[PDB]
Amino acid sequence: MAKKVRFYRNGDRYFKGIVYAVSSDRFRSFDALLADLTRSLSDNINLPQGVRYIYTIDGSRKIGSMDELEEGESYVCSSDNFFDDVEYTKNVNPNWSV
Numbered sequence: 526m527a528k529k530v531r532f533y534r535n536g537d538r539y540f541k542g543i544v545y546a547v548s549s550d551r552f553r554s555f556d557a558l559l560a561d562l563t564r565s566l567s568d569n570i571n572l573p574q575g576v577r578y579i580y581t582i583d584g585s586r587k588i589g590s591m592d593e594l595e596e597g598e599s600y601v602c603s604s605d606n607f608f609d610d611v612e613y614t615k616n617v618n619p620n621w622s623v
Contacts, residue, residue, distance in 0.1 A: 527551070528596045529622060532562060533582070533613040535603035536571045541617055542599060547591050555590055562602050574604035584608035597622045 527548035534540045543565055552558040563575035579588040582599040594600070601613060 528591075528594050530594050530596070531599040531621060532566070532579075533599060533601045534566050534568055534571050535601050535607075536609040536611060537568065538611050538613075538615070540613075542613070542621070544621070547594055549591060552591065558591060566602055572602065572604050576602040577605065578603045580608050582613060584610060 527546040527550075529544060529546055531542040531544050533542050545562075547558060552561065559576050559579075562579075563572070566572055566576055580586060580601045580603065581588070582601060584601065586593075588594060588600060599614060601608065603609075
């Protein structure tokens with residue numbers, strides 16, 4: 526079963542998040558998910574090196590596998606090891622998944 530999650534772009538206060546359905550049957554590896562997020566989140570300023578790392582919404586945890594993603598949660602995609610502490614979910618409907 527795919528997990529429905531919401532991805533945001535490191536450092537971008539104006540992006541409202543992209544909803545993904547994530548499972549190993551569609552993404553053959555974690556690298557394939559990273560590649561597809563590089564495609565959809567394409568932004569030369571905030572993602573200069575594409576999507577190389579995924580963090581929880583608050584930056585507390587680095588996600589290393591699709592198994593670590595959880596239904597209904599939000600995550601931040603980054604080109605590097607620096608998580609930019611901005612209010613990603615400001616003014617986004619907390620019930621976007623309802």
